Symmetry: C3
Subunit: 108 residues, 3 copies
Amino acid sequence: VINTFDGVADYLQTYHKLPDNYITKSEAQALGWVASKGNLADVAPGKSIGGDIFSNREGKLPGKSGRTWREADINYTSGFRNSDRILYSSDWLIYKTTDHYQTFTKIR
Amino acid sequence: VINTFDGVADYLQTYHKLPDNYITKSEAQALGWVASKGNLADVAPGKSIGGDIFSNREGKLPGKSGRTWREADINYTSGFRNSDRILYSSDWLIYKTTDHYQTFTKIR
Amino acid sequence: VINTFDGVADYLQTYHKLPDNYITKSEAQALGWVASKGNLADVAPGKSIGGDIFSNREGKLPGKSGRTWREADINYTSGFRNSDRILYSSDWLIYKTTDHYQTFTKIR
């Protein structure tokens, strides 16, 4: 019902209480809601996950002795992580994937 | 593949079973999926979180003896909670924040 | 700051490290982030939840001896599940709901 900055501010000034569409964290929890901790934006705004080791167990990326592969999320703003990743090797080859490691394209 | 109301209804009438893009809750779980309880819309449609105490440990909001601050989510429809909050004091001052308590603007 | 395929690839080639907006999974976790397992697209791309028994305890759907009701998600792509469901009986009657089982409309 009422959930805008000005709509809520005016209601608070007039009635001295929040509109009927609001419930406290306790009430929400009593109903079965458990706050998710999966949105990276909540704990680290403007950041993205990246720098971890990609095993390359499938072998779709070119292997070599001493070469390790790493990954980083691309196009992430907030919410759930997507399927876009950039893969880079210790010797600097760069690949991309937009389908969560199903296929790769060399981009440099 | 097939996931619309009419596409699924016609497939059910013709084949008497769901299309190959559907899996039961058990099957999804066997694969590693665990239903999230973080979407407030699932347990309380049309509602928003609001009314809880805001500590104001940082002191960006004007303090006073006997004055307590509370908050409420703004612009929430469903899914993850955003960074929009309205702050109101026991004596009725009103502020807003759009960056999850980083900065505040007096709006009344 | 830098999170596009070409922006990140060029930064990696020039500086040999990810931009300052990236943090590893460990670092994110140290900060309080716990990867959600609630996005079906992560474990089963292109799939939707469907085929489970709908109890019909409320009785808004026509009951009969030997008739069981089942449901399936509609319009799902990724992220949180929505409120769209198709209900079908053992004897093939088809209904739809767009408000998470509050109201139903016979569609076949």
